[PDB]
Structure formats: structure tokens, C-alpha cells
């Protein structure tokens, strides 16, 4: 705001004057004046005399002027510079310039209030002077005049024909030009003529100037313009032909060009040039197609022939150029021009990849409201239908958005578009093939024509505004679904994974976390689908092993529920009610159901509440009136409360799902697709309540409209819990369709009967479920499962009469393990014909068979096994190995490689043995996989009969981060060496607490071990409160001033059978200020947990990269780091992690060396350790790429990484540590474009 | 607007009641009530007794109900209609309807100020009742909740995932459905529950009604929804395969489809269907290309072979459809489908043809500010120059505008782009061939590099 101070020194020299100005300091301001011509002055203001910045490209770098011979008179006040054309006066106190014509006429001046200053120039002039310059007008703007007398428009190049600059001049005889990258000229009719650099303009600023360099011109308009061209440069002469007429054209080839030229020449209409648009070049192709002649359009451009022939007709050719390159060829591969530009840094700063189009088409909307139009539309669809399009994805039946075209379709357009296909298909196939359609709008009545609704082009993000604000994300979707159900359209789906990202189709895919959670959510919605943007991929295996396995697992749950779900499809044909409903449908009078959308009903009997939060460690779930059973973990919750529900953020295996009291849930073996085979046994899971409930089982052909005339099958199943028995009725079959189901296996939960009757007859009892299944005719058996006592009852289905079954008495099973026959489990492999197999061709097996063909790399079998709590479970594998020697298989749990099993020869293929291994299981569903992992050194080549999983762990664990936190306690990743996904901190205020829900099989005394950190340097305290009892003091010593050290606090507690609360709290007498990580619980002494073997910090690279870790890195001095951590979701296709969300990478486009290292002290010196890691390497073969173990007492140990493009397991066994420490690391020496991924690094004690 | 006048006549007949109302003219208003089920009432208001308009496609044209055997008592004031589930009272002077449960609990009523009238319906109800229906939320909007307690959003199909309709109901035990092509539901927490036809909405209106046809539902939410499905129709059963997982994809050919299906089957990840985007069809071509299999992408779709091989692997195929036709092929010729549609009048009314794009390309801006970048840019231009491009039409050196992509080029971008060709060409030809260029922006100094300015897309 302030102007210059007093002149304290003036030094004349030729045509130059240098003024020193007082600013209060020892570094005085400098103002240099340079008389360039008789009518052109240069002024350079340099605050505090600092050196001037480089001039912008405005200024002609080669400008030269002849000597002027100006008269510079410094003898008085003002100082006076004169030429024959101008007189410049600088007043001394304070420094102010006045510019006059040589004759004395005043043109402009710096006012008393301030002239030049650090951020621009300020002049005053005649208020009626006409000002010009500054700006023009673009092809999207209101077009003003020439006058700039009241202008505040910025100086910029602009777009679409605009022009502008820091150039302001007047017909009153003067001009002002400021050297600047953009800025803000200002004029008004009080006579102000100002220019300010201001803040960074819309267009950016790449030339910043600390000085203020400007030019003052004196003269008539032509003299002003000539002076402008001396400063900024004259125009080189264009070719003379460019004075001719030119025809620019888009949509043109060589034949048409020749015809055009002939047309002009035949008529003697002069013309000198044609300009060619996209047509001239191979725009879109690899190897610099956007610089290459398109010889399909212009064959004679293969040589100089086209040029020469056109020159002979007097035609020069002009070619369109865009300042960009194609980064993807039409097979979605990176182009050579991309690699050259990327590796040399030739992209515009801040400009990322984006989507362009260059081949337009002309279209027009059809009217589906007319019967004749619909008939026509269908008739032309018949051929595609016959050749395989059996479902109609009716997109954009709502609104056109294309340029000037913004048309709306009417409210009945989706209904009528649907009617066209519906009426047409039903007529053409004689009601023989059911119609399937989807649209992205709904209005009442549309449902009559067999269409679902999908939620449109939603964003790939957790919620609206997470990454961008213009589309909703995943968390909004339940609200849209349930709003659709409230309008009578329950046949709803969404693009699981999202459609839109920042940057269009080239923008990122979902993170593995987002993808996994979205799949779990989508599996409990009516229309289950993935859908990405152009050339994006949504197959689950691309997002890493957690996403692949968690997605697979939930898909198995969905497909197991086909008979449950299908009854709701029928129900929609009778009442319109479908597969989902909001809780308010069942609880119209509950205020907490009135707007509830984070859970919903899936059919009548399941309440689902998917985990939708990023890094979510627990959920608050409202359960309405009733009694609810955890589907995966087995415990009961009374209704009418919000429960705290712990979730494992490390595994992503939890889908919170609750069974409603009275549930009757038909389910079946998992099929790859709905009609893969006949299902002759249907299981019916029954959780009886005191009031009768019922479910009508339903079958039909799945395919035609035969159901409309009675060709279907139903049987009403009903259940009631009575005073000392359970009664189940299987009603008589109804309808003319012969069903595939031959038997029901009723699984009646909550009672293990001593007798099961039917019609005055006690049913035959069998030893277990297996023996019952193998029996023909009716029977019962009993057992135990995750929910407790169970009675199994096998009965014939589709009898002509009702059966009433009654389960009485109570004789609970003594079984200690659940048995999973692996022949009933999920078999996979590298290709469809190399999957693990089922067989019966060796004797001695349990159940109906065993699993073989575990002898081609990648063959595997996967068991889904429920656990009530997290902890150690010794799982027994029954196997046969008649090979003559030991064989290996990998055991994976929740996508982590837990162990390589060495399975000894059993003597023969018909002789079986067992191997028991302690597995780290998490509460709820666990994914247990036995695999021939050739890339980890397994041999494979055994047969597997079953596994047995204990109902109770040897010791349990509870994550602090998943406990109920209150009073300021929160989760954190800001220290090292925590277990699981995080730890708990901020136990600082009185009342701060972490409360654990701990389950005990029987009343008694249990050992607790609490993992905690205390880096304060002194002892701290909390209180322990067990079941709301009397507080006991927990005294927590400090190992020193280091928050990266963790310790165990051991104690005992008296627990009751079932759920117990154990809280750790700062009560008023306690100090607090410790961090909590995990509570371990056992009836015996607590030992190291199977989940806590890893000695490295952040070995899986899962920590939020905002926070650091014990990893360090190295590269050569002067080389940029090649190392990062991310998810690999920005790539197309994705190159995800080996597990969970993130993996380390090494990459550079140019030659590089890079390493990372971590040093840990081992717990037991003079003992053996083992390093394991997942590694994947692609593109250029490096000179060196290896894992390294050193500093352990022995010489360095190396394991090389091969360039295979697939995840491999690297192992360095037999690290004999005598130094007390191990340094583990990875190193690459590459000539360029080697990409290494690293994940799942573990250092463990070797057995 | 005024409510109905006095009841001058009341004729009961089975489950129907026909009321004649005074409006001061010789053409009296008619209000017809029909008890469709024990918990569903149809009301038809016909101003001046005019014949009703045809019902919109909201209404199931085949709907029928069993006889109810409702009691209709015209003997006094109010007139009373009863079923085992509801009690409807119509006061005589003026005509106003009160809807009650059979036990006497008041649910909703037409206030003294006025109920049904020629442009809609107006009810009052408990101010604390929770209202549902009306609208959902699209993929470009802020996403609210389920409650509709203070709603003025119009009733429409909308776009981009939206849903809506003239359907408003409450967990307090009642629903209202008005037959209409768009319109304006209104609720507030004083207890208003209203619906107005209003002016022509944004989406247009092709079904106009002179009468007002509406339905009152009584019951718990599942009963309300079932009655809604009686009036507007139930859903036909979809194929059973549509309960399975489906993979929709844009950018896909037969080989990639086969590899995807193998990937799922190898891993025992269930899947029943693939949906194909533009890839499946000859969109953009003559002879109904937008209905025809693209056999460059899908060779086996020349016959039924692809269909049958995919069916043998448990995969059904879904194809994308757009409600439009291509009116000019890639070669700029009118298409057969244009001639057929134009001669038969099959285009959407008020929708004219328009230019659209569908084949994306991925691009990224270059930086002309760097000498090394300019050298590279020129070096790759030499071959085109030798073969006849002697003038450089430098387009879009100003600003990118593509969807979310809104990038500005800096003020010296035109000058520097121009400099790349100027320096290069002068060096390459040893000052022997004059440079010509044009750009659509100007900043001081750019003229040094031999460029003109054109005024853009005028
Ligand atoms: Ca077995
Ligand atoms: Ca932890
Ligand atoms: Ca990882
Ligand atoms: Mg000079
Ligand atoms: Mg004037
Ligand atoms: Mg500054
Ligand atoms: Mg043309
Ligand atoms: Mg010729
Ligand atoms: Mg070519
Ligand atoms: Mg074999
Ligand atoms: Mg781990
Ligand atoms: Mg009737
Ligand atoms: Mg009207
Ligand atoms: Mg693809
Ligand atoms: Mg194949
Ligand atoms: Mg073709
Ligand atoms: Ni402008
Ligand atoms: Ni809307």
C-alpha cells in the first residue's frame, strides 16, 4: 500500500539514472530509469536493492536500442530527464514520477498516496482519457467494445480466441507495459491507471518477479504500438501464401481434398491453402501417431508425393496440432510417447491424464410411448436376443446431457422402454423365457415390465466428499436402496466398487479395502453387480488376496442362501415386497427404526449391518425388539439396544449379520451358478421362538412364466418352541411342478434332543450328521455348532401329507471339535481344469470322500470355519501320503500364509494320519486354505480327508482398538510395534477407558495378559473393573522413555459363564497415560499368540503412510527415492498387494539403486530365526534384486528375486543370531523400469 | 383454492358410493368412492361431472379385486362407509372426508379450508407422523434419509439412479397414491399431506387428467406396500440366475470375456452373468448397427455359438441399450434406421438430433515451457513437415475442459508452443522456409514466434 520514500542518492550515467530511496533500513530501495528511445522509458524498481528476477518471456531477449543522448539533470528538485519527445520529473521527497510531453503537457503521474511498490504500479491521469488494451473477448463471453475506462478484468492469454496482457495505453498520448506473468490491471473514470501482480491467477504463475519492471511510452497510437513491439518483439514475416484464402476442414480425405481444389480452380476462385483437422494424422495410435500422416485418409502422404502434387496445384497444407499426447493405445497399453514424456518430465505441471473423444456420431432419441414404436424396437432386437443377449441393460432412459442437447425423457419412459422388451420377448418366446432388465430411474408402474433399478454413476469413494464432492460414494448407498424400497421398487442394485473417479476412466479403481467392504455390502442387496468405467476391471483377484478371499467367502454365503432368497423373488410377484426392507417395515412404532439405514433386513429373518467405514475397528449396531443371534460368532443379544460390535480391521473377514428369533432359513450347497446341478438335499436352519413362525419353501423352473398357471412347488415350514420341546411342521406339498428337493435336513438350534418323533413314531437315531446324511429314510441326530446345541432331522420333501416333528429332552453333545469334510469345501486351482478334485478310490476316509489333485501348482481347498472369539485354535488336518517321503502344503488363514506343513508319509494311500497346527483365528468367519503353492516351495501331492476345529481356543485375544472406548480414549498408529491394525491411546482424563467383552465357557478364575506401553519413564496406574465390580489397581511399570516398547501386565479375574465386561479405566486416584494394545485371556498360563509371531514393525506396509515405521531407506546421493507405499489401485489393471490394503514398491523410469532396511533386537539371542516375504517383480530385468539378512553375527545372507511378474514367497531360513539383532532388507540395482513390489514381510523364531 | 361444496345427493351401490356436490351451477361435481379391498379406497373427483380422463401408466390396467361387502350408511351426517379394517366418514356440509381405523382412531382428514379440488388433494394428519415415499436420491445429489416430514421435492422418475412418485405414506398407518404424470407432493410438520398437479414439470407431461384419481391405503407398512402393488402392479419373477453375481464391463472382447469367466471358475467364485457395454454392438453403423452383434469384438456371435458356449459355462449375457438411434453413420450418410424412424414418427417429441461421442481416448498435456520438451516436440514433427504440413494449426493451447478435467495452460503456453515449431523449423531448414502458425490465444511476446490469432469456436 505505501509508496516510495525520499531520494537519498541519484547517479546519472549516459541514458541511465539510478535512484537510491530511503526505506528506514541499511538496504535501501533502488529505482533504475533507462531512456531506451526518445519516447520509451524503462523503469526497474528493486526493493532493498536486491538483484532483479529474470524477465518473463514477454520481453524480447534480443532487444537493442541506439543511444539516445538524454539530458539528465540531478542538480535540483525535481530531478529531470529530457528527450526531444518527453520530460520525466522525479520529485525527491517522497520519490514520485511525473511524465510529460517535451512541450510540458502532463500525461500521467504517481499520486502522493503511492506509485510503484513491491506488488505493482499506480498512476493517475486525466479522468476523461480513453484507455485501450488489457483484454479482448472469447467465443463464450459477452462481447464488449474497445474502451477500457472502467476495467478490472485480469491480464491473461485466456481461452477460445481471447487475448490480453499487462498493456494499458491511451489516445491521450501514453502507454504502460508491465513485465508480468498474469496480474490485475485496474482503471476507473476518476483517472486511476494501475497494475497489481496480486495472488496466483486462475491460469497459474510460473514466472515470479521480486522486482517491478515496467515501460512508459509517449506518443500517438502508432508510436505507442511501435514501442510495444520494440520491447516485446516484432512479428517475423509469414509466407506470402498466407495472405491468400484458406479452407480449414474437419472430415476430409485425399479424394475429397482433390475435388475441393478442382472446384475452386475450375471456377477461378482463388485459394492458397487447405488446413486439415484430425483427419491428417494417426491420432490415437502408438509410436507417435499424433505426429504421423494418416495414410488411410491420405495415401500419397506415404512419401512427398501429396505435398508435391498439391504444390503443383498451388496448395499448401496446414495441419492441426494439440499440445498433448495419447498415453494409451486402442488395446489399453501404454504408448511409446507416454514413456518418453513420463521418463523425461515433459507433461504440463498439474495436468494429469484425462479422457478426450474425437470421432462424433449423430443420434436422436426414440419414443417408447407409442405401441408401433415399441413393436419396431423389439422386432429389430430379435436377432441379438437369439444370439445371446437375454437381459436388457436399458441405460440413459432419463436425460440427455451432450453439448447444447439437454433433453428430458418423460416419467413413463423407463416403464415404456421396459414394456417394449417385456411384451416383445413374452410374445416371441410364447412366455417361455423370463425377462430381465435394469434401468437407472423408476416411476410407479414400471415394475410390471420386469425391470430392476441401479443407482447410476456413483463415485469410487467411501462417502460423498472423501475424494470428490460431485458424486456420492459407498456409505450413501443404503439410503438410496431403502428409499427405493419405500417407493415399491425393492429390486435395486449399485455399481459395487464405484464407477466415477477424479480424472474419468483413467482415474483410480477402488482401494482393496473399499472394494472388499463394497462386495460384502453388495452381497446382501437384491441385484448384486460390479461395474467400472471404460477399460477398468472389477474382478476380485486384481485387488489382492484379502479382497479376493473375503469376496469369495461372502459370495459363498449368498449362493448358499439361494432357496431363502428365491422365495422373496416369488413374494414380489404376489405383493411387490422383495428381498430387502428397512427396519421400519417391521417396527413401525420404534423411533430408533424411523430413519435407520446402517442395517436392514435381508428376507424376514436376517438383519445385516455391513462394515462401511475406512479403518473401522468397531460398530454401533441398533438391534430392535426380539432376541438376536450372531450368524458367524454364535452369541445372543437381547433386542431394543445399540450393541458395541468389535471388528477385525486387519482381516476384513467380518460381515455383521444377525439371525432374528423364529428364523427358518433354507440353504444349500454352494454352486458356481444357479442351475449348475440338481440340489436334492435342502438344509433348513431353525431358531425357534415361543410364537410360531413359518417360511414357505418354493421351487419352479427358474426360467419361464409357467408359474403363472400353477406350475410351481411350495411347502410351508413352521416352527415353535414349546415348554419342554420344539415342534416343526413340514406341510403337504402344493402345486404341479415336480421339485428337485428329495430331503430336508432340519437343523433345529437351541436343543440337543433325546427323542425326535413324527406321527406317533420315534425316529431312528444316528451317531452324527454324517451318519444321518448317509442313511436313506428318516432319522435324527444331534450335535454342537457355533450357536450351541443342535438337533438334526432328515425327512422326505414333497410328500402329499403334512409331517409334524417334535424334538424333546436334552442330551448335549460332548464333542470338542467341529468337523469339516474337505470334499464338501471349496476347490480351486490355476485354471478351470486344474482345480483340486473329489475322490473315493482309496479306502479309510471319513464322510463321502476326500480331496485329491493337489498336485498341479495352485491347487487348493478352502474351508469356511466359524470361531466364537479370536485366538489360538489347534486345527487337526487328516491326510494320506503314500508317496514314500514327506510332502509340503501351505496353510493360509484369512489370506496370510501361516505355515508350510510338512506331512510325513503315512505308509500307503489308504492309510491316513493327522497333523495338528495352531492357527490364529479371528472372531466369526475364518478362511482356512490348504494349497500347493509352488511359488513358496511347496511340493503338494497329498490327499486330504477333513479338518477338525475346536469349539474353544486354547487362549483368546481381544484387540484394544476394537474395544468400547470412552472418556477420550481413541485409536492410533503413531508409535511402533503394536499388534493388529492399531492400539489405544489418550487414556488421559479421569473416566477414560477401554472396555472389553470377554467370553468364558464356565464360571471361574482366568488369567489375563494386557499388552501396554508406558514411555513416561515412571510407573503409571489404571483400574480394572470386572462385570461392574469393585475396582482393582493395575500398576504399570515403564521400561524407559520409549513409546515403541510394549510389555505384558499379567493378572487374574473371576468371570461368569458367557459374556463378561473387563474395563481398564483411569479412576480419580489413577495416573493414566499408558497405551493399550491387546487383552489375552486363558484358563492356563498365557504364552505367545499365533497372531503375534512377527518381530518386524509394519512388515505388511499396512500403516497409514502419514505415520512412519522402523523401516529406513537408502538411495545413491543425488538420486530421487524409488521407494513408496500404496495400494496399486491407480493402475489399469490394478497391481494390488499380496494381503490387505498396501504394499511397498521400488520403481523408477530411469536407472536406479534403492534399498529399505529394518533392524530389530530379537527376544532370545543364540537362537534361530526365519525371514519370509512376498515379492513380485516385472518389466526390465535388474542387475541385482534381493532380500538381505545381515548383522546377525554371521556373514550376509541373500535371496534373489526373479523377474516373473507374479507374487512369490521368498524365505531365508536358519538365521542363527548371536549379535542380539537382525537387519532385514531389500535392494535393487536396475538400468531402469524395474518395478518390484514387496509385502507381508515376517521375521519369526524358527521352530 | 376452494374445497368441495355441499352434498346434494348420495347413491350407494355395492362397494361404491357416488356423491353429487353443489358448485353453484347446473353441472354438479361428482365424487366417486369405491371400496376395492377392506383396506384400500379409490376416490375419483370429477369437476362438474365431466367424464374422467384415461389413467396414466401408473395404474395396472388389468387390476381387479374381490367384492368386499362394505357397509354404506347414507342415512345421516356424516355419511359412513365401513369395513372390518377402516371407517370413512364424509361430512355433508361441506363435503369433507375423514379416514379412521375400524376402531375409531383418526388417521387423516380433509381440513375445513379444503380437501380435494381440481388440481390435487389436501389432507391434514398427526403433526408427528413419519412420512415416507415421494423421492429417492440420484448419483449427483446430496443424499438424505428415509423421512419425508418436510418435503417439497417434485414426484418424478428423475435421472442417474433417482426414483420417485406421487406416493406418500406413514408408519402411523395410512398411505396416499395419486394417479399423475409428475406433480408436487408437499408435507410439513404442522401435519400437511398434499399433492398438486401444478404446471408442466421439467421432465414434461404427456398424460393430462381433468379428474383427480387417488387411493387411500390403511394398515401397517407391509399392508400399505401390498395395496400399492395391487394398484400399480406386482413384479413378474425374474430368471433365477439374476439372484447371482453379475460382472458389467465396458472395454471387453470375446477373448477377455472367456479369460474372465475362466478366472472366476478356476477360483470357485460364483458368477451367473456378464453384461457388455458398447463393445457388444455395431453402434455407429448403418442397417441397425445399434441392434446388431459386433463380430469384430465377438466373432462367435455371428451365429448362436457364443450364446451356447457361455451357457455351457453357466454364463448369461446382458447387453447395453440406449433409447436412441444413429441418424448418420461414420461416413456421414443417413442411415436406414433414420429413414424408418423419421417416416413412421418414432422420435421422442421435442428431441432433435444431436452430435454425441462414445469412443474415449486417454491423453495428457505436454509442457512447452522447457527447452528440452520443445526439442522433442519439434524432432517428432519433422517427418510430417517433410511430407507437407508447412503450417501449424496449434489448437487448445489455452484450457482443457473434459468432465472433471478443467486444467489451464499458463500465459506463455501459446508463445512457447509457437517457439517449438519456430526454432525447430528455422534450424532444420537453415532459415530457408518461413514459419506459419495460428493459435486461439495471445499474450505479449508470442508474436516473436510467427503465430496468428483466431477467435475460437464462434
Ligand atoms: Ca472326507
Ligand atoms: Ca492392537
Ligand atoms: Ca500389505
Ligand atoms: Mg540505450
Ligand atoms: Mg469518456
Ligand atoms: Mg512480491
Ligand atoms: Mg468434408
Ligand atoms: Mg486431380
Ligand atoms: Mg497409419
Ligand atoms: Mg492328475
Ligand atoms: Mg500380518
Ligand atoms: Mg370391487
Ligand atoms: Mg386441471
Ligand atoms: Mg476390460
Ligand atoms: Mg475357454
Ligand atoms: Mg459388424
Ligand atoms: Ni479474458
Ligand atoms: Ni429427485
Tab-separated table of N, CA, C and O in Angstrom, chain B residues 13 17 58 65 68 72 87 97 148 150 167 197 234 239 247 260 272 286 331 361 374 380 383 415 450 457:
chain	number	residue	atom	x	y	z
B	13	UNK	N	-74.210	-48.249	-3.970
B	13	UNK	CA	-74.441	-49.419	-4.825
B	13	UNK	C	-73.286	-50.422	-4.708
B	13	UNK	O	-72.243	-50.259	-5.349
B	17	UNK	N	-69.960	-45.657	-3.765
B	17	UNK	CA	-70.753	-44.532	-3.314
B	17	UNK	C	-70.477	-43.404	-4.308
B	17	UNK	O	-69.313	-43.113	-4.617
B	58	UNK	N	-49.159	-45.459	-14.560
B	58	UNK	CA	-49.006	-45.892	-13.172
B	58	UNK	C	-49.942	-47.048	-12.821
B	58	UNK	O	-49.550	-47.949	-12.082
B	65	UNK	N	-60.263	-56.740	-8.041
B	65	UNK	CA	-60.374	-57.136	-6.646
B	65	UNK	C	-61.659	-57.933	-6.429
B	65	UNK	O	-62.624	-57.763	-7.162
B	68	UNK	N	-66.013	-56.769	-1.490
B	68	UNK	CA	-65.653	-56.519	-0.102
B	68	UNK	C	-66.856	-56.665	0.828
B	68	UNK	O	-66.704	-57.127	1.951
B	72	UNK	N	-72.402	-49.222	3.682
B	72	UNK	CA	-72.523	-47.814	3.298
B	72	UNK	C	-73.810	-47.262	3.899
B	72	UNK	O	-74.902	-47.720	3.566
B	87	UNK	N	-62.855	-47.047	8.595
B	87	UNK	CA	-64.097	-46.290	8.691
B	87	UNK	C	-63.879	-44.955	7.997
B	87	UNK	O	-63.005	-44.173	8.395
B	97	UNK	N	-63.832	-35.526	3.816
B	97	UNK	CA	-63.586	-36.930	4.178
B	97	UNK	C	-62.645	-37.072	5.374
B	97	UNK	O	-61.600	-36.419	5.420
B	148	UNK	N	-39.648	-38.070	5.175
B	148	UNK	CA	-40.156	-37.085	4.220
B	148	UNK	C	-41.111	-36.141	4.948
B	148	UNK	O	-42.206	-35.856	4.468
B	150	UNK	N	-40.700	-32.931	5.861
B	150	UNK	CA	-40.701	-31.542	5.387
B	150	UNK	C	-40.298	-31.470	3.932
B	150	UNK	O	-39.293	-30.869	3.586
B	167	UNK	N	-46.657	-40.874	-4.235
B	167	UNK	CA	-46.932	-41.913	-3.265
B	167	UNK	C	-46.344	-41.455	-1.948
B	167	UNK	O	-45.129	-41.286	-1.831
B	197	UNK	N	-51.007	-31.292	-8.975
B	197	UNK	CA	-50.576	-31.486	-10.349
B	197	UNK	C	-49.600	-30.380	-10.769
B	197	UNK	O	-48.537	-30.655	-11.331
B	234	UNK	N	-47.859	-55.859	-9.461
B	234	UNK	CA	-46.768	-56.653	-8.917
B	234	UNK	C	-45.666	-56.826	-9.955
B	234	UNK	O	-45.852	-56.515	-11.128
B	239	UNK	N	-35.562	-64.229	-14.031
B	239	UNK	CA	-34.919	-65.555	-14.076
B	239	UNK	C	-34.136	-65.804	-12.794
B	239	UNK	O	-33.626	-64.843	-12.211
B	247	UNK	N	-21.022	-59.395	-13.523
B	247	UNK	CA	-19.882	-58.521	-13.807
B	247	UNK	C	-20.258	-57.705	-15.074
B	247	UNK	O	-20.399	-58.276	-16.163
B	260	UNK	N	-11.967	-63.906	-18.292
B	260	UNK	CA	-12.655	-63.526	-17.045
B	260	UNK	C	-13.442	-64.712	-16.455
B	260	UNK	O	-13.319	-65.030	-15.263
B	272	UNK	N	-22.969	-65.700	-12.424
B	272	UNK	CA	-24.008	-66.143	-13.346
B	272	UNK	C	-24.118	-65.334	-14.638
B	272	UNK	O	-24.782	-65.786	-15.582
B	286	UNK	N	-24.636	-48.252	-40.038
B	286	UNK	CA	-25.888	-48.291	-40.793
B	286	UNK	C	-26.543	-49.673	-40.616
B	286	UNK	O	-25.934	-50.586	-40.033
B	331	UNK	N	-19.485	-42.496	-42.012
B	331	UNK	CA	-19.290	-41.871	-43.333
B	331	UNK	C	-20.243	-40.697	-43.683
B	331	UNK	O	-20.305	-40.288	-44.846
B	361	UNK	N	-10.471	-41.663	-25.659
B	361	UNK	CA	-9.012	-41.751	-25.793
B	361	UNK	C	-8.437	-41.130	-24.532
B	361	UNK	O	-9.062	-40.247	-23.940
B	374	UNK	N	10.518	-28.779	-25.966
B	374	UNK	CA	10.342	-28.188	-27.293
B	374	UNK	C	11.171	-28.906	-28.355
B	374	UNK	O	10.684	-29.133	-29.476
B	380	UNK	N	9.939	-34.820	-33.343
B	380	UNK	CA	8.865	-35.708	-33.790
B	380	UNK	C	7.928	-35.129	-34.864
B	380	UNK	O	7.145	-35.875	-35.438
B	383	UNK	N	9.083	-35.312	-39.749
B	383	UNK	CA	8.565	-36.193	-40.812
B	383	UNK	C	7.278	-35.644	-41.433
B	383	UNK	O	7.113	-35.679	-42.660
B	415	UNK	N	2.930	-18.810	-26.782
B	415	UNK	CA	4.267	-18.372	-27.170
B	415	UNK	C	5.277	-19.504	-27.221
B	415	UNK	O	6.027	-19.632	-28.195
B	450	UNK	N	6.091	-16.276	-34.865
B	450	UNK	CA	5.370	-16.382	-36.129
B	450	UNK	C	4.039	-17.094	-35.956
B	450	UNK	O	3.795	-18.143	-36.561
B	457	UNK	N	-14.201	-20.906	-31.284
B	457	UNK	CA	-15.368	-21.653	-31.772
B	457	UNK	C	-16.619	-20.782	-31.781
B	457	UNK	O	-17.525	-20.943	-30.968
